[PDB]
């Protein structure tokens, strides 16, 4: 049995998202849906096609007729930018439970968020292992999509940078970080390290000191 | 009333690993257990279908042949043998009550095959607002907690096979992983 969901869905705040999920005679069968916020685990938030669980907003609903059943978000908010899946449940078929693809709702026209940045030098305990790691911390930033250029004093650098994906966080807005491996050779000789956090064509200041 | 899956962790390619999943709250023999799983970042995916206090078994045709599922009603705990475990079962695996209520959903446990050696992970002070830096670990379950005598963490990356993270406060370190639980203090 195959269950189709639009990969990605994406709403204006307030506006409402209808995420479909089609089968073959669909609503002869019973429908669940599961919502995912990216790091936690799947929530229900409709099952038994129309019926909502406890503690979930009246504005999730659910329909299920004919070759497609719907989650209809009224007033969609940030908070519930998230993965969705439809799950079908079926006691006959040698596959009783049959997930979807699933669907992304991305939530448009978020207010954007200055980087919040925390260069780190590598530890007095690191340099004795004859290691050198430079961290980049990113916080509370939207959109996800930031530029770690790695300088050191006025010359910029290439190897030993490895910057992660941003992740999204509680608040809706994404974290990201960014590791610079170096020699402990290379720490003592330069007189100063730098992360340029470029987000949104507006970089960021970042500076440590070798000395102390 | 609720589920708590276990017996996760780092495998090698081919090998197996046993899943548990306690239950607790309801009457564990009467109603059919489920596994399901998740790639990281895909979409879900039913892995087997134990049938009540009964015995009836279907089964994802990705583990066909290969993953065992039992159930245990006396001691109301529910099991999932693997077998030749690959990249296409490195997943979270979750242990759902398929019922009349609403299904329960217990937490699932993450199981990674891999191709390098199972490591520790390695703990060292950051300070400038100060931090906690946990590197050189596999597999990806790091976990920080703050708690000092007198708050988010940020996601790891991939260096030279082995993964890192780290963290900071607002204004002593303590992380959990399977290898080994770490503690480092910060001025």
């Known amino acids: 049995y195959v269950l189709t969901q639009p990969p990605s869905v994406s709403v204006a705040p307030g506006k409402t998202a209808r995420i479909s999920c089609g089968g073959n005679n669909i609503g002869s069968k019973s429908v669940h849906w599961y919502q995912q916020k990216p790091g936690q685990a799947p929530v229900l938030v409709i099952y038994?096609?129309?019926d909502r669980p406890s503690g979930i907003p009246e504005r999730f609903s659910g329909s299920n007729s004919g070759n497609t059943a719907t989650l209809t978000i009224s007033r969609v908010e940030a908070g519930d930018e998230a993965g969705y899946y439809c799950?079908?449940?079926?006691?006959?078929?040698?596959?009783?439970?049959?997930f979807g693809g699933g669907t992304k709702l991305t939530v448009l026209r978020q207010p954007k968020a200055a980087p919040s940045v925390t260069l780190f030098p590598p530890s007095s305990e690191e340099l004795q292992a004859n290691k050198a790691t430079l961290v980049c911390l990113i916080s509370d930033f939207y959109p996800g999509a930031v530029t770690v250029a790695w300088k050191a004093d006025s010359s910029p650098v290439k190897a030993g940078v490895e910057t992660t994906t941003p992740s999204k966080q509680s608040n809706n807005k994404y974290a990201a970080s960014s590791y610079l491996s170096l020699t402990p050779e290379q720490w003592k000789s330069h007189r100063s390290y730098s992360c340029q956090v470029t987000h949104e064509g507006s970089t960021v200041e970042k500076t440590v000191a070798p000395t102390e | 009333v609720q589920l708590v899956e276990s017996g996760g962790g780092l495998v090698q390619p081919g090998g197996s690993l046993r899943l548990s999943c306690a239950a607790s709250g309801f009457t564990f023999s009467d109603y059919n257990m489920n596994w399901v799983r998740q790639a990281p970042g895909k979409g879900l995916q039913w892995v087997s279908y134990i049938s009540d206090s009964a015995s009836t078994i279907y089964y994802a045709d990705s583990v066909k042949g290969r993953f065992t599922i039992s159930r245990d009603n006396a001691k109301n705990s529910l099991y999932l043998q693997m077998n030749s475990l690959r990249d296409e079962d490195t997943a979270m695996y979750y242990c759902?009550?398929?019922?009349?209520?609403?299904?329960?959903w217990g937490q699932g446990t993450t199981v990674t095959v891999s191709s390098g050696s199972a490591s520790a992970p390695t703990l060292f002070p950051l300070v400038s607002l100060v931090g906690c830096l946990a590197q050189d670990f596999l597999p990806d379950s790091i976990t920080f907690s703050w708690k000092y005598k007198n708050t988010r963490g940020f996601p790891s990356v991939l260096r030279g096979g082995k993964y890192a993270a780290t963290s900071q406060v607002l204004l002593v370190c303590k992380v959990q992983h399977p290898n080994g639980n770490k503690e480092k203090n910060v001025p």
């Open positions: 038994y096609d129309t």
């Open positions: 799950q079908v449940w079926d006691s006959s078929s040698d596959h009783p439970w049959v």
């Open positions: 759902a009550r398929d019922g009349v209520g609403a299904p329960l």
